Design a protein around this nucleic acid. Structure first.
Lengths: 185, 51, 156, 222, 53, 148
RNA sequence: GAAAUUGUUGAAAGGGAAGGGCAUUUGAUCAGACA
RNA sequence: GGAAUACUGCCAGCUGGGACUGAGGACUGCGACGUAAGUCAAGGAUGCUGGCAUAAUGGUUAUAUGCCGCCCGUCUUGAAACACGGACCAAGGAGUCUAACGUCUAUGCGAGUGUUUGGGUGUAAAACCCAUACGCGUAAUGAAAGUGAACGUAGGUUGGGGCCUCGCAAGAGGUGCACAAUCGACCGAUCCUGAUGUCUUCGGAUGGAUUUGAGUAAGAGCAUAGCUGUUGGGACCCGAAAG
RNA sequence: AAGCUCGUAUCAGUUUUAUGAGGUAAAGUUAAAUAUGUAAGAAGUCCUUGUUACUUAAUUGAACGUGGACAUUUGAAUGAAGAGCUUUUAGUGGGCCAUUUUUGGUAAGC
RNA sequence: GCCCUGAAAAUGGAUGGCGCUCAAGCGUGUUACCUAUACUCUACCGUCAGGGUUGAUAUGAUGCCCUGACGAGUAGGCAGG
């Protein structure tokens, strides 16, 4: 027999392909498995594995975050890419021109982007416009801003906000949460 | 598709090691040795034959 | 339908065969087989007879004659692997033999050509045979093994 | 298209040079070995004629073979064997001998049999059992492009250059010796000798340092 | 050792490299010729048992 | 769908995924929250800190009406304008005409200051305000009328 | 009109159980295939 | 004074017999051999001959022979156990539903989201359309009265996929999303300071602090579905002495 | 089990060099063998001139920085089916034996 | 050193049995040989990892192919039927 320093028959723990049954989704997974293979530029290889991401791992990139990345120096002419959904932010009262390419836009972020003389794109047209990825910005939305991640790792002195039904007085503020009743934490 | 051992199957032994041909044609496996006259000095032999 | 269908079907195309690297190369007989050598047939019709080797045919068989005047074994193809070669020779140089081939022996009573050449060859052999005493009696007799005989010991 | 025709005898010329350079370069490794084995002979002779003695240079390379099964091994040796890449019974690789690697062997001696390989066995193993490690994948050598596309950065552009870097224990011994997948041997052809393997070679078993007697055991296993 | 390594290198920067700036383990000892002249091998043998009590 | 459950993969195995030593039995740790001071204490501490005890004043007959005070940051506060009219106010922003935003009409009880409205003067009606909320409004050129 | 279980006929087997695995001989049967 | 054998080791030394395998299926490659054309044992088998077309080979099943083979399920450190259950057969027979949730995944929309308590309607328990609210979410924090998030390109430093510039490339530089570390600024609570001011004890500006929060710092949640998990229910099935 | 960010890379039931700690065996205060902590570089080194409300008798220190310079023998051996990261949940919580030591017990399949 | 004595337990009785004496016993040495599911080489099944291949004018992109390595398993978990 063989003496193994590792565990045998052990998968890599990655998405080889989406779990979605969506048909039009798999047409992009089909389009970027082709470009990732034959186009030698890493951009295609980045967008591919971003089409396999689950929902929780795809937070939406608001149309305000898109305006920061344009204020970022030299990037005002780039074509921002979002694999995910673009959402509207009206808290910004001005928006640049530029371009955006994403899977899904919300109806609000479609107007706002079109409103300024800019343009909304899909991913397929980006592959046709820039197969290699010339002059693009990928942007991810914040992952740890979720409501559940707020609860991850609860335990003494970690400040993790216990999972609880009702918030207010009289619900788990008393013994162990303050020095006067018992101890603190 | 299948591994052809050298050390048998002379044709694969000749793609590896292009020197295998001129090795044998000149022998060099059976190559003879120059002759020497040196003898062990009488101290070395005295030690070896000792009690 | 009693069975739906497979949705891709295998093609009835046949691929040709990869070029094989093998070549017909002439058999190298074992060193005990020399033209004009008493042979001992180990199997077949004539198993046990003691016959005289003549020529090595193109099909790798061996051409033998009894002679038919002696032990009653005609000119016949025999496989070199079923035949014990012996240590006693007859002089075969008096025989043409150039007329033979494998095509001659094809199957495709006995034809009158094969009876002519049967006797033509013995004129040369039966001359040489009687020269050593008993070799006419010897080429006529059948071999056997006896109680106590050990083929790994005995010489042939 | 030019293609097939005009790039053939253009390429086929470069093929001619690789083995024309392997031609001259191996000739130099054969004259190098023989005059070294001769000077070690002439030195023991020139000394005995001076009434003196001649101590050999110590052996800079060993070949280790794993003699024991895969279980009931204490933790400390079991970690060493895995650092020499001895993952099964009867396998083995070449080990450079320094003070660092030499106190490892003292830990695993009950579990291995090792010695000093001659140029004979280094040449048989590599030709017969020698494989490369290419993107893992344990490739058989069989060709000079498998060695040149991997070790060519170091030189070592033929299989005659491996055997040289291995036996001279040259600078690149670590790169080259890790480019060889561990040698998978068979059991000894004529048996092991002795009734019982797991005594030390000095008490009549198979393990420990058997020195130049390893050349004979490996060949029955090759 | 860090400073010595700094010295040797910057020194060897006008010396045309060939640094050998690592530490290497104790090697197997190289060849040599003893000289029996003046030193004769002294034959020793095991010694018999004794009580000596 | 019970064709997908895992007890439809456990057919044929004796103990049905519950183990052969500890078996599966009725209530090993008592019903519900029982033993929360005693044998489940290590659980209540860590993941329910503060469970036991009493904090402050009781309130008899509490009504959530009195306490209704929704909050609208200066982040938004321009959303309350019709998006068709809205861009009429952003451009051509002067006094003698200023948008009257009734925040109680939209269900808001207090205007907080979270940040940066634009430079357009705006009339903001609100029940309550915060000290920073007006400073940004009033410095934008508008005012805050209080209502009831 | 199933199974336990039973009567009849036929076949085989049998030295203190019976039954099973690997292997082939012997008996009965079976296609396929060729042509 | 010469040798030879022995022993050890090596040859890219020679030759003979035996057993097993024949994967793959147009060419490609590396070589070898030849002035040349070409051939070859060089990225895995071909050529020649014969027999039976048969139950010959092969299957299937009973028997016989050689070696092997303890009785199943269960608890158990340990069962073939002189531990427990089981004569046999057929049919029934055990992790379900739900209310309330955690993680995970898919889907629609997305600073929102949820049509179905109800009304309109209909081919009539379906499907279709819809006003008002309401629930969660977008604001936290204190027991409470109460107050309530930009010094700055929503900041700085280390590291970061990706993109852009140069260069033959190697690599360096510019920008750096998410994310991890870390120091700041902002809101609330606790302790400290206590301004121009005032119905003279109200007001609370300013400025702090090895303090504290389930916070801000360009929103991500809502709804349905599914797997797995938990709580209450007869609760995976059967079973008490009792009250 | 679900994956996530990444991929030349920090690691390691291992040695070596360097350097601490120990008080058992033997010795009769001394002190092993085996085990054990740390280090072997870029989060580095040398210079040059900035910040502070701490520190100083002090333009002096401390901590952090700007500018410049030294890259793969970059700082020992070997190895590395890659390194890290998170969520979520099953079973288990009666153990038994052998070796090398050892207490209770006369000993024991204790 | 070997052997004998010391040496006595209950159904019949066990170097495993027969039986073995210049052994088929005891101590030691050199060889030859036997055979595990382990080792080497080959084919095939599956698992994992790494790569090749989207062009009409066919039939599968959960597809086809290339290359390697690996395979015990109760309680338990998962994927595919």
């Amino acid at each position: 027999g063989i003496d193994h320093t590792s565990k045998q028959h052990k998968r890599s723990g990655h998405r080889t392909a989406p779990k979605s049954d969506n048909v039009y989704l798999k047409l992009l997974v089909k389009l970027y498995t082709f470009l990732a293979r034959r186009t030698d530029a890493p951009f295609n290889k980045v967008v591919l594995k971003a089409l396999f991401l689950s929902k929780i791992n795809r937070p939406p990139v608001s149309v305000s975050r898109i305006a920061r990345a344009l204020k970022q120096e030299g990037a005002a002419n780039k074509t921002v890419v979002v694999v995910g959904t673009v959402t509207d932010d009206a808290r910004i009262f001005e928006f640049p021109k530029t371009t955006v390419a994403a899977l899904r836009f919300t109806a609000g972020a479609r107007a706002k982007i079109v409103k300024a003389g800019g343009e909304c794109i899909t991913l397929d047209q980006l592959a046709v416009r820039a197969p290699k990825g010339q002059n693009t910005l990928i942007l991810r939305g914040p992952r740890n801003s979720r409501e559940a991640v707020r609860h991850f790792g609860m335990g003494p002195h970690k400040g993790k906000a216990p999972r609880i039904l009702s918030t207010g007085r009289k619900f788990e503020r008393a013994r162990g949460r303050r020095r006067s009743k018992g101890f603190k934490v | 598709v299948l591994k052809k051992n050298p050390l048998k199957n002379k044709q694969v032994l000749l793609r590896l090691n292009p020197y295998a041909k001129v090795f044998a044609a000149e022998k060099l496996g059976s190559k003879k040795a120059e002759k020497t006259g040196t003898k062990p000095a009488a101290v070395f032999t005295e030690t070896l034959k000792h009690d | 339908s009693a069975q739906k269908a497979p949705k891709w079907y295998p093609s009835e195309d046949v691929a040709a065969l990869k070029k094989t690297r093998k070549a017909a190369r002439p058999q190298k007989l074992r060193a005990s087989l020399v033209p004009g050598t008493v042979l001992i047939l180990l199997a077949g019709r004539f198993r046990g007879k003691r016959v005289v080797y003549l020529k090595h045919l193109e099909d790798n068989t061996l051409l033998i004659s009894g002679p038919f005047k002696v032990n009653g074994v005609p000119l016949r193809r025999v496989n070199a692997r079923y035949v014990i070669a012996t240590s006693t020779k007859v002089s075969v140089e008096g025989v043409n033999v150039e007329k033979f081939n494998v095509e001659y022996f094809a199957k495709e009573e006995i034809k009158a050509e094969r009876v002519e050449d049967q006797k033509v060859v013995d004129k040369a052999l039966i001359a040489e045979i009687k020269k050593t005493p008993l070799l006419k009696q010897y080429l006529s007799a059948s071999f056997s093994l006896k109680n106590g005989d050990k083929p790994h010991m005995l010489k042939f | 298209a030019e293609q097939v025709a005009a790039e053939r005898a253009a390429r086929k010329a470069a093929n001619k040079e690789k083995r024309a350079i392997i031609l001259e370069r191996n000739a130099a490794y054969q004259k190098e070995y023989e005059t070294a084995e001769r000077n070690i002979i002439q030195a023991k002779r020139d000394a005995k004629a001076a009434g003196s003695y001649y101590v050999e240079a110590q052996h800079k390379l060993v070949f280790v073979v794993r003699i024991k099964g895969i279980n009931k091994i204490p933790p400390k040796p079991r970690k060493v064997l895995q650092l020499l890449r001895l993952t099964r019974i009867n396998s083995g690789t070449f080990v450079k001998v320094t003070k660092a690697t030499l106190e490892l062997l003292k830990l695993i001696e009950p579990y291995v049999a090792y010695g000093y390989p001659s140029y004979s066995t280094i040449r048989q193993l590599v030709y017969k059992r020698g494989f490369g490690k290419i993107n893992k994948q344990r490739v058989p050598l069989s060709d000079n492009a498998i060695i040149e596309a991997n070790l060519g950065k170091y030189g070592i552009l033929s299989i005659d250059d491996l055997i040289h870097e291995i036996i001279t224990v040259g600078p690149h011994f670590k790169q080259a010796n890790n480019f060889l997948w561990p040698f998978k041997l068979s059991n000894p052809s004529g048996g092991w000798g002795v009734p019982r393997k797991f005594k030390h070679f000095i008490q009549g078993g198979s393990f420990g340092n058997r020195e130049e007697f390893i050349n004979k055991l490996v060949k029955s296993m090759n | 050792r860090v400073k010595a390594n700094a010295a040797k290198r910057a020194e060897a920067k006008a010396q045309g490299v060939a640094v050998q700036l690592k530490r290497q383990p104790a090697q197997p000892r190289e060849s040599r010729i003893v000289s029996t002249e003046g030193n004769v091998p002294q034959t020793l043998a095991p010694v018999p048992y004794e009580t000596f009590i | 769908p019970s064709r997908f459950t895992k007890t439809r993969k456990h057919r044929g195995h004796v103990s049905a995924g519950k183990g052969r030593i500890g078996k599966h039995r009725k209530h090993p740790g008592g019903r519900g929250m029982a033993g929360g001071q005693h044998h489940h204490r290590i659980n209540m501490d860590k993941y329910h800190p503060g469970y036991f005890g009493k904090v402050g004043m009781r309130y008899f007959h509490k009504q959530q009406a009195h306490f209704w005070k929704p909050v609208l940051n200066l982040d938004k506060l321009w959303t309350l304008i019709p998006e068709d009219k809205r861009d009429q106010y952003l451009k051509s922003a002067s006094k003698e005409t200023a948008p009257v935003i009734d925040t109680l009409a939209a269900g808001y009880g207090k205007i907080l200051g979270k940040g940066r409205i634009p430079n357009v003067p705006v009339i903001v009606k609100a029940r309550f305000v915060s000290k920073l909320a007006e400073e940004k409004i009033r410095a934008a050129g508008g005012v805050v009328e209080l209502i009831a």
